[PDB]
Amino acid sequence: GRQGARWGQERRLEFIDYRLRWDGQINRSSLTDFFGISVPQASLDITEYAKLAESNLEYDTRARVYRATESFKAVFPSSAVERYLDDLLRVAPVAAVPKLGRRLNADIVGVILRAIRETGFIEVFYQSLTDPEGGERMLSPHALVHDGNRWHVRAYCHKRKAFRDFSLTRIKCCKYVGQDRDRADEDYAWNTMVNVVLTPHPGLTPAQRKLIENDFLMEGGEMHVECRRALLLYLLFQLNLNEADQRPEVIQLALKNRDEIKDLIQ
Amino acid sequence: GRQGARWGQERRLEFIDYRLRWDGQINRSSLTDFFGISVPQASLDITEYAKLAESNLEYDTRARVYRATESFKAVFPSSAVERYLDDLLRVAPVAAVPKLGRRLNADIVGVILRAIRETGFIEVFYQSLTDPEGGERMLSPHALVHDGNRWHVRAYCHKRKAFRDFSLTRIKCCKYVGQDRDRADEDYAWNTMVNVVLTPHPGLTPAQRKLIENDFLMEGGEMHVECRRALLLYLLFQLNLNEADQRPEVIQLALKNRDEIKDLIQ
């Protein structure tokens, strides 16, 4: 009722805050288009956003948009994540492809977050298709990493004496067991910044070569992205350059009837 | 201040609501581990959740967890999306791989949502690497589809007289232009349910064959997933079965220095 209305309105205020942060402006008809609300309601939402931050935005009468002011500081922490729009879209017409992969375990994630926050020791049972028997492992983690769909923890392995990555869905048990020293400054790969230069794939026709350079805002046929050395492997996966242990276990399934399901594709 | 505290607490109430929906229970130490709050605060959060739905949960003194009651109905719409935990993790230690892909355009998404809601005509400029020149197109959409990272719109193409998929980042312009008739019941592929049977990949050793069947809860070495015919192609991408037009444009980049960046991988 009222709680459902205040909850729904709060997401629209986060939409406003997001649009101002990333696009620099918002139209009243953006709210009506996106959420299916009336023009009056969109006017109430904009007024409510202004009560939280009176100088975050300003109406431009000629253009008929609200623009982010010079003093704009986002009101909600959610505005900082680029993909938050995807979440707003998914929560407030929309359909999903079936996810084959395993579901993230909130208990294991919580223990790892605690251990990162407190620089703790954790004892895990890690089990992978590369070593099916699995084994217990002693880790000191210092970062939880999002790779599109997949999560992995960056941690110090103590028997092995090196910093490594561990896929969250391959962690079957996770227990906090002690307090450690901070090691983050010894993970050189994690801290070394690499300037990755991308160009349009050789072989593209002139037209698709110019399209891709326009789509990715390249200067002189080049694009620059800063990556930590310990994350290069994950960036290259997006370009489909490698294919191996650190990809999902879903890849290791197979269709019982590959002939019959292929016919059904159109 | 107070607004920041009520906003932060609301995410913890959504965590509670999510855990009850998906895991059936929540521990007080789950809140403290995940959010870094004090035990007293976690007690205040649980009490606040109970005020919204007094019978959604019940404390089990022996196990020391709050369990979802028989009458549990989620309090927040966000609890319905499995991947909402990933969003809570990303908003409230955490790092991200650089996203190479283009950012979702909220204006275009809003026009498409409006057209789906109102069964409208839309006029788009669609531009792809398969046809670089691009072209204007007349579409009547009826679903917005999430495929992990990627979005596409399922729509009726009128010059072509068929239902097709259109990647959202390849839509460069989108305008609502008219009102249409409802066509959803004529999209047979979208409405035809397919029972996809998956098995462990042939060739796996006995150990990794049993691991994967335990990980995906298979009965008799088999797994069943319902897919709409018009979504089979996207399910097969997760198994890496095809590789082509409907994958990201990012795949069509290349590393300027493939030798130097390969050395840096460890």
Side-chain angles (χ1 to χ4, degrees), chain A residues 1-82 84-218 220-242 244 246-257 260-261 263-265, chain B residues 1-82 84-218 220-242 244 246-257 260-261 263-265:
Chain A
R2 288 195 172 183
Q3 183 274 335
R6 295 161 191 175
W7 193 90
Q9 179 176 58
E10 190 84 341
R11 311 288 79 73
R12 303 197 300 268
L13 307 177
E14 303 182 337
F15 184 86
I16 292 169
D17 197 60
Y18 179 96
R19 299 272 328 247
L20 298 175
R21 163 57 178 94
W22 291 96
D23 293 326
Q25 47 172 113
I26 183 164
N27 198 326
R28 180 163 54 162
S29 67
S30 183
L31 288 166
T32 58
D33 283 1
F34 196 103
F35 292 98
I37 56 173
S38 71
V39 164
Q41 182 63 66
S43 278
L44 292 173
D45 293 347
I46 290 155
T47 292
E48 280 309 295
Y49 181 82
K51 292 184 180 179
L52 311 170
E54 272 298 347
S55 274
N56 256 15
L57 71 182
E58 61 90 19
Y59 189 55
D60 176 350
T61 44
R62 183 151 204 103
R64 281 200 198 155
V65 304
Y66 296 84
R67 293 182 192 287
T69 64
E70 253 169 4
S71 63
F72 172 82
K73 187 171 173 301
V75 175
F76 306 99
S78 47
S79 296
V81 351
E82 187 169 25
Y84 195 60
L85 184 63
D86 308 44
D87 181 72
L88 288 159
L89 186 56
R90 185 79 169 84
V91 160
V94 179
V97 183
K99 301 169 251 312
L100 289 179
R102 287 166 297 193
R103 205 216 316 154
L104 204 58
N105 186 320
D107 288 320
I108 288 159
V109 166
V111 177
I112 290 173
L113 287 173
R114 181 189 181 192
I116 294 163
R117 215 153 48 216
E118 306 179 351
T119 315
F121 281 97
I122 54 177
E123 171 86 339
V124 313
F125 184 77
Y126 191 78
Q127 198 175 19
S128 167
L129 269 200
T130 49
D131 216 333
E133 73 173 355
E136 287 242 294
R137 294 237 199 179
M138 196 68 220
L139 310 178
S140 294
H142 71 86
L144 202 64
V145 184
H146 196 207
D147 174 16
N149 321 286
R150 294 305 166 203
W151 291 92
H152 66 92
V153 57
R154 184 70 171 171
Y156 187 72
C157 193
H158 291 271
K159 298 195 66 229
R160 193 169 192 163
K161 204 183 173 202
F163 290 90
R164 303 297 288 264
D165 312 324
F166 297 83
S167 187
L168 254 63
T169 61
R170 289 156 172 80
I171 288 166
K172 313 298 171 76
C173 158
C174 192
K175 202 199 150 57
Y176 182 98
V177 291
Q179 177 89 50
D180 198 1
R181 68 181 177 82
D182 191 308
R183 299 175 194 265
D185 318 303
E186 305 179 61
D187 193 357
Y188 57 96
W190 181 263
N191 298 315
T192 299
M193 297 299 281
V194 170
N195 179 71
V196 182
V197 184
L198 306 172
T199 76
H201 198 294
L204 289 178
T205 69
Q208 48 192 177
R209 183 157 206 287
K210 296 300 168 205
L211 179 65
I212 190 179
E213 89 181 22
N214 282 341
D215 288 12
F216 294 77
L217 303 185
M218 311 188 170
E222 278 184 7
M223 176 192 184
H224 286 262
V225 53
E226 291 280 315
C227 202
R228 333 182 88 114
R229 186 165 173 233
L231 290 187
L232 283 176
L233 177 62
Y234 298 96
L235 186 63
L236 264 50
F237 282 147
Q238 307 179 25
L239 302 175
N240 273 15
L241 294 191
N242 288 342
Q246 326 205 353
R247 282 191 135 149
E249 290 203 352
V250 162
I251 297 179
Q252 307 285 308
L253 302 169
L255 282 165
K256 180 184 176 178
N257 308 278
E260 157 202 320
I261 261 51
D263 293 351
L264 299 174
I265 297 192
Chain B
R2 288 195 172 183
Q3 183 274 335
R6 295 161 191 175
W7 193 90
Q9 179 176 58
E10 190 84 341
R11 311 288 79 73
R12 303 197 300 268
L13 307 177
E14 303 182 337
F15 184 86
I16 292 169
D17 197 60
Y18 179 96
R19 299 272 328 247
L20 298 175
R21 163 57 178 94
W22 291 96
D23 293 326
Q25 47 172 113
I26 183 164
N27 198 326
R28 180 163 54 162
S29 67
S30 183
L31 288 166
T32 58
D33 283 1
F34 196 103
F35 292 98
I37 56 173
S38 71
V39 164
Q41 182 63 66
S43 278
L44 292 173
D45 293 347
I46 290 155
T47 292
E48 280 309 295
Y49 181 82
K51 292 184 180 179
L52 311 170
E54 272 298 347
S55 274
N56 256 15
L57 71 182
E58 61 90 19
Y59 189 55
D60 176 350
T61 44
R62 183 151 204 103
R64 281 200 198 155
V65 304
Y66 296 84
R67 293 182 192 287
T69 64
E70 253 169 4
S71 63
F72 172 82
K73 187 171 173 301
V75 175
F76 306 99
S78 47
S79 296
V81 351
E82 187 169 25
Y84 195 60
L85 184 63
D86 308 44
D87 181 72
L88 288 159
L89 186 56
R90 185 79 169 84
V91 160
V94 179
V97 183
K99 301 169 251 312
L100 289 179
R102 287 166 297 193
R103 205 216 316 154
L104 204 58
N105 186 320
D107 288 320
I108 288 159
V109 166
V111 177
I112 290 173
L113 287 173
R114 181 189 181 192
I116 294 163
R117 215 153 48 216
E118 306 179 351
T119 315
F121 281 97
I122 54 177
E123 171 86 339
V124 313
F125 184 77
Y126 191 78
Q127 198 175 19
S128 167
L129 269 200
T130 49
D131 216 333
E133 73 173 355
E136 287 242 294
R137 294 237 199 179
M138 196 68 220
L139 310 178
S140 294
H142 71 86
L144 202 64
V145 184
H146 196 207
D147 174 16
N149 321 286
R150 294 305 166 203
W151 291 92
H152 66 92
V153 57
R154 184 70 171 171
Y156 187 72
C157 193
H158 291 271
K159 298 195 66 229
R160 193 169 192 163
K161 204 183 173 202
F163 290 90
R164 303 297 288 264
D165 312 324
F166 297 83
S167 187
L168 254 63
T169 61
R170 289 156 172 80
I171 288 166
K172 313 298 171 76
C173 158
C174 192
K175 202 199 150 57
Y176 182 98
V177 291
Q179 177 89 50
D180 198 1
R181 68 181 177 82
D182 191 308
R183 299 175 194 265
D185 318 303
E186 305 179 61
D187 193 357
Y188 57 96
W190 181 263
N191 298 315
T192 299
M193 297 299 281
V194 170
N195 179 71
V196 182
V197 184
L198 306 172
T199 76
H201 198 294
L204 289 178
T205 69
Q208 48 192 177
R209 183 157 206 287
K210 296 300 168 205
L211 179 65
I212 190 179
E213 89 181 22
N214 282 341
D215 288 12
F216 294 77
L217 303 185
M218 311 188 170
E222 278 184 7
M223 176 192 184
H224 286 262
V225 53
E226 291 280 315
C227 202
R228 333 182 88 114
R229 186 165 173 233
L231 290 187
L232 283 176
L233 177 62
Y234 298 96
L235 186 63
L236 264 50
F237 282 147
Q238 307 179 25
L239 302 175
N240 273 15
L241 294 191
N242 288 342
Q246 326 205 353
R247 282 191 135 149
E249 290 202 352
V250 162
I251 297 179
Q252 307 285 308
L253 302 169
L255 282 165
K256 180 184 176 178
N257 308 278
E260 157 202 320
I261 261 51
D263 293 351
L264 299 174
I265 297 192

